[PDB]
Design a protein around this ligand. Structure first.
Ligand SMILES: [Mn+2]
Ligand SMILES: [Mn+2]
Length: 503
């Protein structure tokens, strides 16, 4: 059996500058020999090319979902952005039923959400689109409950989003701030119900301070040394008439973890974090499904991905291995399989334990040698058609923002890569060597401070097949087509990416 392997060097990309560039400063003679011998190109792993907004750096979850899917997998922010840009949003059934509930009960529409452009949990421009829809459908009373950010965006930036939003209310002639809460209170995720109950009480016009304007309460908070995230919830005088029977709520956050708790308070009948009388006849709508204990109408339902690489392998009676150390094990399993835990038929997996250290600069090789020794043991069985391997080190060590250890991490991975790839070539097989986004390519700012994040840089591709030319550009969704091409397996129509090998 001739194996084909995808080998993901996590957080390893192409960047022109050598300054703070561990990829370029490392001694990587195996990678370099493969790169000089075999066909090569580079592909995009950030922004629109992987289903993220323009200018947004790639990441492991979105990267491995795009790799495994063989298509661009649109993440929530972009999905919703595009729904707004092309009209479907204003047609959405769930939002229009929310509105029909209010219109038909002569009650109130409430909107909850993180009021920033952070884009991790929400985007405030989706609030504006909801205001427009409500206005088009003639709703009269819209109450906006602002949760302030300061965490995904500058720590004192709330006043500018509030200012713009107040102009939106005036421009559309609809909506008002009813309550204002730091995300500390409204978006807690550790079952600290005391914090939540403060946000609830302000939303509901029960117990809270009151100020005349959103600006005034935030400015008062700044004065006491409490920035955005930590603003004590408050009610806006004469602009809050409570959440009453018959009302509707639309929560525009798309990220589940920090939105679930507040939603359980309102719309989990079994909620017992503290005592409540829940609203009767409440239409509670969430932009996504936050958990299965919230009785909500879901605005953007999850889409299951059919025919990821692993499902195609299965349906061609191939065997596959997923292998990584702990830190990238969900990536090569769950995310690779399109957000599915269950193994495919003919799939087996190998988890290697990562070291238990606070930061991986303390052991730059991590468990890369044991991953490689596991993989060698597996290949010696001679029964694998497909391998998906991730070497975690460059991303996990690179996050430390320390150059010499990130270099050593890369050098450790290069030693393992030589052993893995030479064994595969020995077996008359093929490797695709690539990455899921950048990081170790830049671990220093231009002024030599630690830089600890991913990059937007494009990622290398090496395909270890002689006498073939790669396409000049492409994207992560092209990698699984390239695997199928190497395996001579037919590619189904719902994999819309394209093999990197030219024909
Ligand atoms: Mn990654
Ligand atoms: Mn990372």
């Amino acid at each position: 059996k001739k194996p084909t392997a995808l080998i993901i060097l996590d957080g390893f990309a192409n960047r022109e500058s050598e300054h703070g560039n561990a990829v370029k400063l490392a001694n990587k003679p195996n990678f370099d020999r493969y790169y000089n011998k075999y066909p090569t190109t580079q592909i995009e792993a950030s922004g629109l090319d992987v289903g993220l907004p323009e200018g947004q750096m790639g990441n492991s979850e979105v990267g491995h979902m795009n790799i495994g899917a063989g298509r661009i997998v649109y993440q929530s922010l972009t999905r919703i952005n595009k729904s707004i840009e092309d009209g479907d949003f204003f047609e959405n059934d769930v939002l229009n039923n929310a509105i029909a509930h209010v219109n038909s009960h002569d009650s109130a529409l409430h909107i909850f959400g993180l009021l920033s452009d952070g884009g991790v949990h929400s985007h405030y421009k989706h609030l504006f689109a909801l205001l427009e829809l409500a206005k088009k459908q003639g709703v009269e009373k819209v109450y906006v409950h602002a949760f302030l950010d300061g965490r995904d965006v500058d720590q004192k930036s709330a006043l500018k989003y509030i200012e713009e939003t107040e102009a939106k209310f005036n421009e559309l002639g609809i909506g008002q701030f009813a309550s204002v809460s730091g995300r500390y209170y409204a978006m807690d995720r550790d079952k600290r119900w005391e914090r939540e109950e403060k946000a609830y009480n302000a939303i509901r016009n029960f117990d809270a301070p009151t100020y005349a304007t959103a600006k005034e309460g935030v400015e008062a908070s700044y004065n006491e040394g409490l920035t955005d995230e930590f603003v004590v919830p408050f009610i806006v005088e004469n602009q809050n008439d409570g959440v009453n029977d018959g009302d509707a709520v639309i929560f525009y956050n798309f990220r589940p973890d920090r939105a679930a708790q507040l939603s359980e308070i309102f719309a989990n009948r079994a909620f017992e974090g503290f005592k409540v009388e829940q609203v009767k006849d409440l239409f509670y709508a969430t932009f996504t499904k936050y958990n299965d204990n919230i009785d909500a109408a879901i605005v953007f339902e999850k889409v299951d991905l059919n025919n990821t690489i692993g499902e195609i392998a299965q349906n061609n009676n191939l065997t596959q291995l997923r292998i990584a150390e702990t830190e990238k094990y969900p990536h090569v399993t769950y995310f690779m399989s399109g957000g599915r835990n269950e193994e495919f038929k003919g799939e087996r997996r190998r988890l290697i334990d990562s070291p238990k250290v606070a930061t991986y600069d303390l052991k730059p090789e991590m468990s890369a040698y044991e991953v490689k020794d596991a993989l060698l043991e597996e290949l010696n069985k001679g029964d694998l058609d497909l391998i998906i391997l991730n070497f975690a080190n460059p991303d996990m060590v690179g996050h430390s923002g320390m150059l010499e250890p990130t270099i050593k991490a890369i050098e450790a991975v290069d030693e393992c890569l030589g052993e893995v790839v030479d064994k595969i070539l020995d077996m008359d097989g093929y490797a695709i060597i690539t990455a899921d986004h950048g990081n170790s390519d830049q671990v220093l700012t231009d002024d030599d401070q630690p830089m600890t994040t991913h990059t937007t840089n494009p990622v290398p591709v090496i395909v270890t097949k002689e006498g073939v030319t790669l396409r000049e550009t492409g994207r992560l969704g092209d990698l699984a087509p390239t695997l199928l091409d190497l395996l001579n397996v037919e590619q189904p129509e719902d994999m819309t990416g394209e093999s990197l090998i030219k024909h």
